[PDB]
Scaffold this active site. Structure first.
Site, PDB file in Angstrom:
ATOM      1  N   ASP A  46      30.985 -22.788 -12.593  1.00  0.00           N
ATOM      2  CA  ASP A  46      29.639 -22.289 -12.300  1.00  0.00           C
ATOM      3  C   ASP A  46      28.989 -23.219 -11.270  1.00  0.00           C
ATOM      4  OD1 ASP A  46      27.479 -20.497 -12.432  1.00  0.00           O
ATOM      5  OD2 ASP A  46      26.877 -21.039 -14.572  1.00  0.00           O
ATOM      6  N   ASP A  47      27.909 -22.799 -10.610  1.00  0.00           N
ATOM      7  CA  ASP A  47      27.336 -23.673  -9.596  1.00  0.00           C
ATOM      8  C   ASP A  47      26.610 -24.900 -10.200  1.00  0.00           C
ATOM      9  OD1 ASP A  47      25.392 -21.698 -10.435  1.00  0.00           O
ATOM     10  OD2 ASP A  47      24.087 -22.376  -8.763  1.00  0.00           O
ATOM     11  N   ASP A  87      22.061 -26.442 -16.371  1.00  0.00           N
ATOM     12  CA  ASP A  87      20.663 -26.892 -16.460  1.00  0.00           C
ATOM     13  C   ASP A  87      20.364 -27.214 -17.939  1.00  0.00           C
ATOM     14  OD1 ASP A  87      17.855 -26.862 -16.833  1.00  0.00           O
ATOM     15  OD2 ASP A  87      17.436 -25.672 -15.027  1.00  0.00           O
TER      16      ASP A  87
END
Ligand SMILES: Nc1nc2c(ncn2[C@@H]2O[C@H](COP(=O)(O)O)[C@@H](O)[C@H]2O)c(=O)[nH]1
Ligand SMILES: Nc1nc2c(ncn2[C@@H]2O[C@H](COP(=O)(O)O)[C@@H](O)[C@H]2O)c(=O)[nH]1
Lengths: 150, 150, 150, 150
Positions: free
Chosen positions: A87-88, A91
């Site tokens: 995934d980028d 968070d």
């Protein structure tokens, strides 16, 4: 609180640092991209590792009363053994938790990690504070801006 | 026929022009990326169109003199109805045509097209001459280069 | 101490942060660029501050063991009062100090500073370690690079 | 009428094509940058040609009743013999006319030229239509833009 701007060039620099850590490429069966954020990073990893088997996992959310839960739109089969899942960013890791649990044997990596999400991934490149918003290059354009004076 | 350098920023400009033509997003069920070249354009389209259902078709192709051998490594199910299938570029249109046989109801689009491939795709953004090599930004880096005069 | 790659986009972000600190533009008569490294930052500052009076100081410097020889090829007249003098970076601060002897009333700024040079400039934006080489975008190109795995 | 967006990378590609045409570097005494547009291109030329002598010419305009005329704020001395004079673009060539006349023996080059300005320069790289606005990279930023859908 100042947004962190990620240019395409810089994203690829970080993704190449990650790719180097993922050598040798032969250890991997393929890559699973977390849609949508992972698509570009997956493209870079697949190029750098010479990996042609690239699949996706697609999750979305929905509300019901005061709650909010995740829905699987499409997933690669299996428990992720031999795969990289990318995934980028991570968070808080709500989606990352679901992804971990679907692919418990994958090596789960991101480019960026904020502190509350960091424990959910196996590797990442860049530490970002919890209160910093990461602006990815697919969300941006090269656009006129007025001069700071006049 | 000097190579045509495609920077990340310019690739995204072109892909946004394609995304505008593909509006309204509601006409589409999803996007299928032709791996690997289609992964980055797919990420851009998926962001611009608000489409989270993104899948892949992965094929390996090897030219043996005048004939190509195709091996499907992984393929999204179905005939493509309601899907955009995106690849980065079409040269001969051989890959496009093969992919279109797998997904005969998909709307097949690329960013770049050389003349032979133009008729073999549903839409494309940029014309490239037949003998021009396109250098894509996932194959490039920002690298020192000596001055033209020393 | 791997080299620090500065893309054009990132250089401009840094230079804009410097330009914001230099507001209001009305405090300045003009900008003197230290050629050649200061030319691009000067263009950016001149755009951001609305300053059309831009001049240069051109010097050649050659290290002979422990001593530098300075040759002024061309210099803007005066003592620098009311001017910003901008160079791209300070390492030792030797060049800055020499330039400041020529223009003792100028406000001397750079984009990047290594620790030795930091006290020898009036303002700078980015800290760079002493043993890190900064690769500036005018010395680089977008160039093919082989995949990490072949 | 669609703006022509010039990224930093692309500007440098064009400027390097120009630099190659200006070899051998030994034919030149130096470069005169037309402020402000010529500053960045001058920086690139000076790097690529190994030229350390870089000076500027700074012009502005003023109105009086229904007329508009040019004012010289600062100029390099001489008639430009042995110099390259560079501006970023020529459009209608009002400023270029003044510059030509101050430096009649310079080799006057730009990156871009529109048709009405083209006769005023000795060389340029890219043809741009008269009605197209050229957006240079010092006027732009990498900035959030809303997705085309939703
Ligand atoms: N980077 C790059 N790849 C190309 C180019 N021409 C063809 N290819 C690759 O070769 C494959 C064959 O293209 P086709 O001839 O089937 O249209 C495509 O997957 C494409 O990625 C080019 O100009 N640049
Ligand atoms: N590109 C680049 N130039 C440097 C670096 N360090 C020093 N220089 C060049 O060396 C010169 C000497 O810097 P000083 O030591 O006088 O501060 C400067 O003009 C600067 O351009 C670096 O890290 N990168």
């Amino acid at each position: 609180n100042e947004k962190y701007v990620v240019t395409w060039d810089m994203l690829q620099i970080h993704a190449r640092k990650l790719a180097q850590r993922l050598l040798p490429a032969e250890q991997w069966k393929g890559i699973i991209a977390v849609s949508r954020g992972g698509l570009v990073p997956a493209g870079i990893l697949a190029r750098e590792l010479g990996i042609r088997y690239v699949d996706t996992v697609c999750i979305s959310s929905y509300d019901h009363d005061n709650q909010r839960d995740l829905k699987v739109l499409k997933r690669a089969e299996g428990d992720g053994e031999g795969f990289i899942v990318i995934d980028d960013l991570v968070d808080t890791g709500g989606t990352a938790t679901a992804i971990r649990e679907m692919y418990p044997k994958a090596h789960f990596v991101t480019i960026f990690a904020k502190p509350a999400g960091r424990p959910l991934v196996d590797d990442y490149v860049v530490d970002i504070p919890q209160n910093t918003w990461i602006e990815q290059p697919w969300d941006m354009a090269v656009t006129f801006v007025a001069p700071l004076s006049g």
